[PDB]
């Protein structure tokens, strides 16, 4: 039976300063015991200063992060080119999230 | 006469009546400007307001980080074209990783108001637009009409007035075209076009609205004090 | 008849003219922004005396930062609030925020040409809408069944609009204080309305940034009607 | 005066845009007729090319059906190729459906109430277009079925369609009340056609090159429209009489 | 859920239900009224799966509340009966199935009659001198068949559920917190506070 | 009266006037034409220059329906796109379905058979466009002309438009004069002549030259653009002949 | 495209008329004459075969029709509105009744059917009025032979006799004076056959007129053998020379 | 599905089919509402050219929404059964996700919005009816009484009539109702109701019927001979 | 578009009234005058078929007098066609109700829900009313004996006799003058014959022209029965009361 899910690895880490903060992951993509690329980014500028990972399934992940960077355009467009702050973009990217409930992207978020 | 009922209706001369009303509403709209050199594409209008106690009407909205337009007529016509191209622009880049080039967005716009004009119900557009754009074949303008007739034009003008604007530009052609690597300038030949549209009013801080695009600028409005530098 | 949708031959859409009509004859609404708060006043005018003036809703709520003021066929105004309030909520619930007035306002406004043979006519109401935020101050605006809006420092709108207007022109500088504000609305709705002014048939209401929107006691605008006429009186 | 732009009933019980769709039949100023033999059905038809610049081959109101169906139109050919197309579609859809090729007067009838819905269906327009459809059929033999705009039809020994169809139609009826039988006693399709050419030429009072004629033969398991020489080859043999 | 049990006597029907509601290994509440009021001289109560019992009844309860506004006139037990019967039979093949057992309980007064319906899940219907609904009937019913009569008080009736919930205290595995008691006749539904 | 004031409404002489009415639309536009050849058919139309402001090469009028059709129309532009992008999804399904490319008949009737249903209902307006089309299948080259009745016929040459007689007039001294067939590389040049021969009778405005291609030689039966030194070979070919 | 046509074509005026129904009883009084008589033993009903053109074969165009093996339909008014009529008539005999019950409808309910799709061609969006009236001759089990009459407004009568059409006033006079309780089928076919000739202008043989009966059970027309409950059709079409044979006997 | 729009403004800023709507309410038969200081009255004329009329089961003109609230109206009968209907359930459906009966105010509005809706959707035209809706709200003893008409617009009313002749009766109520002093009995708000009427009415016969609202669900609708009793008594201090 | 052909039938005049339902009205006033008559035993229903032929079947027609139930029926003034629509949506209602209640549907709630039908073909989609006004005629165990009538506007009314059709207004005066509240059912007969004998438009009421209908308590105890007359007992009750 087909399987929708994958796992591709990698791992991530950000971290908070008083007035800066850190998203890193590793750059190795990998299906079992092979190397898909040893140099393939997972971390991404989004506009507004906002850094996201979604890492897990990597086609999720993708998709994710090209929704979020979608809505950051529109959001300029129907608010008056208003920046997204932070916590903003973390409710959209819940509802982002939750909309596929039950049938869910595979990837732990962070920004 | 008989034959304005509807946009459906032939006239016994093969005239749509409804379409011409429509392109009427255009013609009361305040003038909107444009012209483009080989590097640089820009839109100028002149907004108009209620009164002395109410805002300046826009009259500029960006589509994408390559492409904007202007508009004169029904501003909520112009908000249900330019939301289609926004969309149009977006799909293109997130399923083709493509920049939607100015001239499929005239055709686009073309289809989308020709509809409009052979169905029952509806009504056309009563909007034209000015869309400006840097692509991977330089820069363009395009002239919309509500018709459904798209143009590329080096220049024109559309709007109250605008008859004035769009014969100068016809004078000027061979100067403003060659108006390369020189936004400031460009701007400048835009703003003396527009003002040869004025009646009993000039060019203010707040009534006076720029948008360029070119090869190395990103679609940007300028309004307020920062076209002070052009008044 | 002829296409609900037609344009005349000056290139107007002749529904939308004809609910312009309608609105002329509505009880006047009155806004004045300042940089202490934006003033939002109406005309009750009750059709008759058993009638308990209380009952009559022409300001209206829309969120804690955004109120609203009405005129012309009323009843037309519910499903444009209703439009209002969920999509002031809906906003707060997707992005952890207040929703700008601006974007309210063309919100409603999408609503007015979704009509044809979508709802069956335009809407026969214009709205004052009025409200607060973080970017651009103070705000008011004049949403109209066009689906135009404009952004107004003064604004009057209903059967004594133009007149109300003139005086708007020359009464509003951008230094007015919100209890100038208050006043002005009260005076220049005794100009336009047919009955007396009252504390009945006339109802005032506000929104800061502190203390949000709030409709005003009959009491309250009782005292600032007393207040409004021995002012006038002096001089 | 709305019950004239629409089939509704006028105060007499009529139906004008019906009448008025038959009077569009005759729009093209084309003359058809059609005749059956002992084994063939003929259908010839005026064949009129005005413009010099015209491709001739694609000037056709005659259409190949089925394999074993043949169907000429008298009006506009717009209305003459949305009939065509329709009824090659329910003639394919038959076969398919029930396991047999579809008859002569079945086609005649569904395309019939057809056009009888638009007769009573507002928002449907009546086709300006007679119908003639020709075959030999397995169970019937020849076989000649009309259909009109009020969605009429029957069956003929004989028919013509056009504006100078009542001449042709008095000229086939004088040469059966003559000849006492349903058909023409004749072998060969070739006679047949021979003959159809023939009579029409009487009727009309006009002679006939190879390229003001158009002829389709129906034979059993095949219906099948003639070239410019085999009619001139036809038009020859008539001379030589 | 568990334990519904109904009596019809001579002048009235008394329904007695369980105020326990566990959920896994813990006691949530154990004064939960298994029971609504549908029409005033009409008591339907339930048991079954979580969430769908208590939707049912107030579903019910909606429907017969808008019949008596729309006619000015109160529904027969036996219409009423009839009408939850219908609606549990259209469940039990939709894609998800109201898994709910009711015992309905009323005094009909054009009759002057009290009633007693038991109605299961699948839309099973059967009027019944006594009834109960789940494990409950295993026990009670043939203490009902040896000690019940027809001609009984609401007084013998109450003795005669007493007798009841003593066994089910002695004989069921699970404690189910005692039974709040209702008795409907010809003055309406009370509850008997002290059982 | 009033039967002219609803489209698929027949008036008492059996006519459409709502669709004659479109006609009217057609002859009010620019002249375009088709001239079959050889192996192929070529197509070309007058592009009236309103202003200097319009640049030069850039409206493109001409279109292409998959890669072996070219359609050009004179009348209401829009109304002929909107033609063409059904042309373009029939011809899709039909390549999905068949595999090969649709035939030129085969084509000619699905925009025949649109068009025609755009006659049958008084919720739609008739096109007001008479369209040009064709090109090269495995049968050879064909050349079509459709109108706004939906009735279309095949021609050996075609024009639609306000110079319609002019260039009508002008394809039959080309057909008399040439039974044996004018080859791809002189329909061009033809082309070229009649388009500037047909501006006379729209001499107001001067225009701009367009043609296209569809030659199993010279293109290898694919549509082409004609461009650059073979276009202007062409119009200097049309300026020698008005002089 | 698709029907903005979803309002009433046939309403009320002022005086209270439906227009479209009386507008379609003035078709059905231009039709030519048919004709119905019922018998104790049988119904007979009959009509002219009005031929349009001599080289038409009239045989092919059947106005008398079987809708079911006991039930027979002759009319008046629009033919293509008939043709699409028996058509509906025939199915909607199968999918509301035999398809349920296993058995043919019987002749009032069968006419009920007809009736009620004549209705809604009155009321519904975007159509008009059928311009036909039917006569409607049947037998079953438990109501015997009966005659009916369909009219455009979907109303319909059982008759002892009658007829509709043009010459329907003379004929319906001409059939009072003839008709009583006691006429035997044969009696009817004469009668009708009179009846007719009176409405009749050309040639008055076999095969311009058409006419059927409904009476006994035919088993040589049945097609099979060896269900003895399966006795066979009661509705028969004369042949063009068994009506020539009564016509000697005028 | 049939589309027209048949609300539709005019040049003027009027919509034709609201205001004609308007003109079957001044038609249908007079209805009057007058709240006192613990209960409202409603009063509802029934035309007399109707004898032979069985009263026990022809649809009374007052109707009960729920057990808290009820509703009269003046104007075309048959659409006042669809408003009744949708009040009912809705009525209904309040209690079950609310916990708590509708408050007359929020029954009204809902009523209103009904009516609005039908004033600019395709293919329907407006309710000829307008609406007198009182009671009390839950656990409250504050009387209520609202009336909506064909626009949608609603309003609360001291003493409120609608229907044919109500200029009249509006007349005398303005004049003889006392804001200050609202009826402080059952029996004084009944009397001012029926003098009301029988300004307009005729004889005070089968004429007139009065329904009664009080607090926590108490209404009841008087018979003729109680009736009957108010119209006698009025009359005999009417000889002055 | 099709605007051009709709007649709009669901708008008000400028007066307030449905144009249709005042044109079905009087489209109504056309039709064979019927009558109801409710006693303290029983209904009677009474109804002048149109003007018949002689060789009509009389004793297989059914025109005017329709069966809902075995406790409920209707008589008809208007289309037959129309009222034949109305009266099997009517059946199955009844029959819905049945099923659901396991109780015989009581009368009102039948008659609103045909109204009801009626009142929407009024309001919205576009479509001409039906042209049909009823008398219905029923028993249930809370009201006992009951008349009402609906008419085209769906709004409906309680009676104690009532006549729709031609000569409503001289057949109503009539019924107004010679009915009294203890009435019995035999006098209702009588009264209802001698109404339409003076109102009807024809030279001399006989059988032939009339259906007729009682609805009594006349079988056995406590048990209502519906007795649809045989033209031959039309032609006897005619002859019983005079009248021929």
């Not at chain 3, 059967?159 to 708007?168: I, N, P, T, Y």
């Not at chain 4, 000649?144 to 969605?151: E, F, Q, W």
């Amino acid at each position: 039976q087909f399987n929708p899910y994958g796992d591709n690895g990698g791992t991530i880490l950000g971290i908070a300063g008083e007035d800066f903060a850190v998203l890193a992951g590793d750059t190795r993509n990998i299906t079992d015991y092979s190397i898909n690329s040893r140099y393939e980014p997972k971390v991404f500028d989004c506009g507004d200063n906002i850094v996201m990972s979604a890492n897990g399934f990597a086609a999720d992940g993708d998709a994710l992060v090209k929704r979020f960077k979608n809505s950051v355009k529109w959001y300029h467009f129907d608010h008056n080119d208003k920046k997204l702050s932070i916590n903003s973009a973390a409710r959209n990217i819940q509802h982002l999230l939750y909309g596929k409930r039950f049938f869910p992207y595979y990837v732990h978020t962070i920004i | 006469n008989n034959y304005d009922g509807d946009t459906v209706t032939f006239s016994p001369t093969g005239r749509l009546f409804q379409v011409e009303y429509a392109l009427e509403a255009i013609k009361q709209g305040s003038v909107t400007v444009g012209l483009r050199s080989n590097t640089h594409a820009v839109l100028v209008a002149l907004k108009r307001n209620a009164d002395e106690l109410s805002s300046y009407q826009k009259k500029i909205i960006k589509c994408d980080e390559h492409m904007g337009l202007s508009l004169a007529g029904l501003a909520p016509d112009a908000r249900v074209l330019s939301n289609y191209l926004r969309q149009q622009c977006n799909y293109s880049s997130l399923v083709f990783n493509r920049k939607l080039a100015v001239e499929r967005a005239g055709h686009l716009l073309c289809d989308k108001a020709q509809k409009n004009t052979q169905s029952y119900g509806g009504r056309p557009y009563g909007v034209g637009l000015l869309i400006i754009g840097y692509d991977k074949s330089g820069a363009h303008l395009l002239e919309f009409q509500p018709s459904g007739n798209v143009t590329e034009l080096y220049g024109t003008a559309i709007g109250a007035r605008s008859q004035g604007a769009k014969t100068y530009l016809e004078r000027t052609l061979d100067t403003f075209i060659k108006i390369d690597g020189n936004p400031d300038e460009l701007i400048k030949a835009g703003v003396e076009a527009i003002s040869q549209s004025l009646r009993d009013e000039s060019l203010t801080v707040d009534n006076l609205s720029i948008a360029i695009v070119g090869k190395d600028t990103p679609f940007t409005i300028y309004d307020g004090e920062a076209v002070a530098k052009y008044i | 008849d002829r296409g609900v949708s037609t344009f005349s031959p000056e290139g107007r859409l002749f529904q939308v003219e004809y609910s312009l009509e309608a609105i002329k004859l509505g009880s006047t609404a009155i806004g004045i922004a300042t940089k202490e708060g934006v003033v939002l006043g109406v005309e009750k005018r009750a059709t008759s005396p058993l009638l308990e003036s209380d009952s009559i809703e022409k300001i209206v709520e829309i969120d804690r930062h955004i109120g609203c003021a009405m005129s012309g066929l009323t009843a037309d105004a519910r499903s444009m609030i209703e439009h209002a309030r969920t999509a002031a909520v809906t906003h707060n619930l997707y992005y952890d925020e207040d929703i700008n007035v601006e974007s309210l306002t063309q919100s409603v406004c999408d609503l007015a040409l979704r009509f044809g043979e979508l709802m069956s006519r335009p809407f026969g109401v214009a709205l004052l809408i009025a409200g607060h935020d973080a970017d651009d101050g103070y705000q008011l605006f004049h949403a109209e069944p066009s689906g135009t809006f404009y952004r107004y420092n003064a604004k009057a709108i209903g059967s004594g609009s133009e007149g109300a207007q003139a005086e708007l022109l020359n009464e509003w500088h951008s230094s007015l204080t919100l209890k100038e504000a208050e006043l002005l609305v009260l005076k220049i709705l005794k100009q336009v309305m047919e009955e007396k002014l009252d504390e009945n048939n006339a109802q005032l209401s506000c929104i800061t940034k502190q203390d949000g929107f709030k409709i005003y006691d009959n009491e309250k605008t009782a005292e600032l009607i007393k207040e409004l006429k021995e002012k006038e009186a002096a001089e | 005066g709305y019950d004239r732009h629409i089939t509704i009933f006028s105060p007499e019980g009529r139906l004008y845009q019906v009448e008025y769709a038959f009077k569009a039949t005759n729009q093209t100023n084309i003359n058809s007729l059609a005749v059956r033999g002992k084994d063939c059905t003929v259908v010839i038809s005026q064949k009129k090319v005005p413009d010099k610049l015209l491709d001739p081959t694609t000037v056709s109101y005659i259409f190949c059906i089925s394999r074993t169906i043949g169907m000429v139109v008298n009006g506009p050919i717009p209305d003459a190729r949305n009939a065509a197309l329709r009824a090659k579609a329910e003639a394919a859809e038959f076969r398919y459906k029930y396991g047999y090729d579809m008859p002569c007067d079945v086609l005649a009838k569904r395309m019939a109430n057809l056009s009888q819905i638009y007769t009573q269906r507002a928002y449907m327009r009546p086709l300006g277009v007679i119908l003639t459809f020709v075959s030999v059929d397995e169970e019937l033999g020849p076989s000649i079925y009309k259909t009109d705009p009020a969605g009429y039809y029957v069956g003929y020994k004989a028919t013509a369609t056009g504006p100078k169809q009542q001449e042709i139609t008095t000229n086939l009826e004088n040469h059966f009340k003559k000849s006492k039988i349903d058909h023409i006693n004749e072998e060969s399709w070739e006679k047949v056609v021979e003959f159809a050419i023939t009579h029409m030429i009487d009727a009309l009072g006009t002679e006939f090159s190879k390229n003001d004629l158009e002829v389709g033969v129906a034979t059993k398991d095949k219906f099948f429209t003639l070239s410019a020489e085999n009619i001139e080859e036809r038009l020859v043999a008539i001379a030589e009489q | 859920m568990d334990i519904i049990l109904g009596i019809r006597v001579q002048d009235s029907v008394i329904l007695a239900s369980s105020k326990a509601v566990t959920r896994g290994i813990s006691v949530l509440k154990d004064s939960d009224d298994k029971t609504r009021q549908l029409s005033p001289h009409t008591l339907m109560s339930f048991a079954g799966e979580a969430g769908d019992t208590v939707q049912f009844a107030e579903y019910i309860q909606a429907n017969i509340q808008l019949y008596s506004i729309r006619e000015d006139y109160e529904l027969s037990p036996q219409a009423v009966s009839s009408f939850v019967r219908q609606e549990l039979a259209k469940s039990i093949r939709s894609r998800r199935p109201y898994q709910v057992n009711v015992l309905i309980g009323g005094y009909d007064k054009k009759k002057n009659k009290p009633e007693l319906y038991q109605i299961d899940y699948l839309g099973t219907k059967v009027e019944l001198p006594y009834g109960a609904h789940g494990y409950s009937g295993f026990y009670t019913f043939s203490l009902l068949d040896h000690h019940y009569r027809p001609d009984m008080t609401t007084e013998e009736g109450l003795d005669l559920l007493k007798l009841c919930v003593q066994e089910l205290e002695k004989r069921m595995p699970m404690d189910f917190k005692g039974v709040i008691v209702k008795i409907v006749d010809k003055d309406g539904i009370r509850q008997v506070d002290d059982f | 009266t009033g039967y002219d004031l609803s489209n698929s409404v027949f008036s008492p002489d059996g006519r459409n006037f709502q669709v004659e009415y479109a006609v009217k639309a057609v002859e009010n536009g620019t002249t375009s034409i088709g001239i079959k050849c050889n192996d192929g058919v070529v197509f070309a139309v007058e592009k009236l220059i309103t202003s200097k402001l319009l640049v030069p090469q850039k409206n493109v009028k001409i279109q292409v329906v998959d890669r072996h059709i070219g359609c050009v129309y004179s009348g209401l532009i829009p109304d002929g796109r909107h033609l063409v992008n059904r042309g373009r999804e029939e011809a899709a399904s039909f390549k999905k379905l068949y595999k090969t490319p649709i035939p030129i008949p085969a084509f000619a009737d699905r925009l025949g058979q649109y068009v025609q249903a755009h006659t049958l209902y008084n919720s739609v307006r008739p096109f007001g466009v008479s369209t040009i089309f064709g090109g090269v299948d495995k049968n050879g080259a064909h050349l079509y002309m459709l109108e706004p009745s939906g009735s279309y016929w095949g021609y050996k040459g075609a024009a639609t438009g306000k110079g319609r007689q002019s260039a009508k007039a002008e394809l039959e001294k080309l057909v008399d004069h040439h039974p044996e067939g004018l080859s791809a590389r002189e329909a061009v040049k033809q082309a070229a002549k009649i388009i500037y021969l047909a501006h006379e009778d729209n001499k107001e405005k001067d225009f701009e030259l367009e043609i296209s291609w569809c030659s199993l030689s010279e293109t290898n039966g694919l549509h082409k653009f004609v461009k650059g030194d073979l276009l202007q070979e062409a119009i200097d070919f049309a300026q020698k002949e008005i002089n | 495209m698709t029907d903005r046509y979803s309002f009433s074509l046939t309403t009320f005026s002022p005086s209270g008329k439906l227009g479209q129904i009386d507008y379609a009883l003035t078709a059905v009084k231009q039709g030519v004459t048919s004709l119905g008589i019922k018998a104790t033993n049988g119904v007979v009903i009959a009509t002219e075969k009005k031929s349009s053109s001599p080289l038409a074969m009239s045989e092919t165009l059947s106005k008398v029709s079987l809708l079911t093996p006991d039930i027979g339909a002759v009319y008046s008014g629009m033919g293509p509105d008939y043709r699409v009529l028996v058509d509906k008539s025939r199915k909607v005999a199968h999918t509301s009744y035999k398809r349920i019950y296993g058995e043919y409808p019987p002749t009032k309910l069968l006419v009920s059917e007809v009736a009620k799709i004549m209705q809604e061609a009155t009321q519904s969006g975007g159509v008009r009025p059928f311009g036909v009236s039917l006569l409607i001759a049947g037998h079953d089990e438990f109501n015997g032979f009966s005659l009916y009459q369909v009219d455009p407004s979907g109303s319909y009568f059982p008759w002892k006799a009658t007829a509709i059409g043009k010459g329907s006033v003379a004929a319906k006079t001409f059939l009072e004076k003839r008709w009583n309780d006691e006429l035997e089928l044969e009696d009817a076919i004469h009668i009708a056959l009179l009846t007719l000739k009176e409405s009749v202008e050309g040639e008055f043989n076999g095969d311009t007129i058409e006419l059927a009966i409904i009476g006994d059970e035919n088993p040589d027309l049945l097609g099979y053998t060896g269900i003895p409950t399966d006795k066979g059709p009661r509705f028969r079409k004369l042949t063009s020379q068994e009506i020539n044979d009564r016509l000697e006997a005028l | 599905g049939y589309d027209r729009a048949l609300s539709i403004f005019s040049p003027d800023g009027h919509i034709f089919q609201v205001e004609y709507a308007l003109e079957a309410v001044k038609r249908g038969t007079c209805a009057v509402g007058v709240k006192g200081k613990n209960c409202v009255v409603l009063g509802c004329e029934r035309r007399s050219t109707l004898k032979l009329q069985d009263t026990r089961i022809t649809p009374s003109k007052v109707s009960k929404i729920d057990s808290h609230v009820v509703l009269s109206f003046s104007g075309l009968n048959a659409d006042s059964r669809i408003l009744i209907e949708k009040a009912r359930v809705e009525a209904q459906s309040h209690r079950l996700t609310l916990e708590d009966p509708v408050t007359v105010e929020y029954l009204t509005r809902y009523v209103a919005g009904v009516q609005q809706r039908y004033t600019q959707s395709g293919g329907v035209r407006p309710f000829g009816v307008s609406t007198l809706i009182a009671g009390f709200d839950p656990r409250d003893d504050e009387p209520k009484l609202y009336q909506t008409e064909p626009s949608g617009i609603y309003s609360s009313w001291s003493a409120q009539t609608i229907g044919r002749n109500s200029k009249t009766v509006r007349e005398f109520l303005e004049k003889n109702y006392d804001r200050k002093e609202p009826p402080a009995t059952v029996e004084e708000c009944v009397k001012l109701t029926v003098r009301s009427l029988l300004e307009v009415v005729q004889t005070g016969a089968k004429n007139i019927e009065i329904t009664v609202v009080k607090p926590d669900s108490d209404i009841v609708a008087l018979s003729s001979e109680e009736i009957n009793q108010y119209v006698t008594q009025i009359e005999q201090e009417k000889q002055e | 578009g099709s605007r051009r052909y709709d007649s709009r039938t669901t708008i008000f005049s400028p007066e307030g009234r449905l144009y249709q339902v005042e044109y079905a009205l009087e489209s109504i006033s056309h039709a064979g005058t019927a009558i109801g008559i409710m006693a303290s035993d029983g209904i009677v229903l009474a109804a002048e078929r149109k003007v018949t032929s002689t060789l009509l079947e009389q004793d297989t027609s059914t025109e005017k007098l329709y069966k809902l139930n075995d406790k409920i029926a209707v008589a008809v003034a208007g289309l037959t066609a129309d009222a034949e629509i109305l009266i099997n949506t009517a059946r199955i209602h009844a029959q819905n109700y049945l099923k659901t209640y396991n109780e015989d549907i009581p009368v009102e709630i039948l008659v609103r829900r045909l109204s009801d039908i009626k009142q929407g073909y009024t309001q919205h989609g576009g479509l001409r009313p039906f042209g049909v006004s009823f008398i219905y005629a029923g028993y249930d165990d809370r009201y006992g004996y009951q008349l009402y009538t609906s008419n085209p506007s769906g709004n409906y009314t309680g009676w104690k006799a009532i006549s729709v059709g031609a000569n409503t207004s001289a057949a109503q005066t009539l019924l107004q003058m010679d009915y009294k509240d203890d009435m019995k059912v035999d006098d209702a007969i009588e009264l209802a014959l001698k109404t339409l004998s003076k109102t009807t438009d024809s030279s001399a009421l006989t059988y032939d022209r009339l259906e007729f209908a009682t609805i009594r308590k006349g079988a056995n105890d406590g048990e209502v029965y519906q007795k649809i007359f045989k033209p031959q007992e039309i032609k006897d009750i005619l002859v019983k009361t005079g009248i021929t």
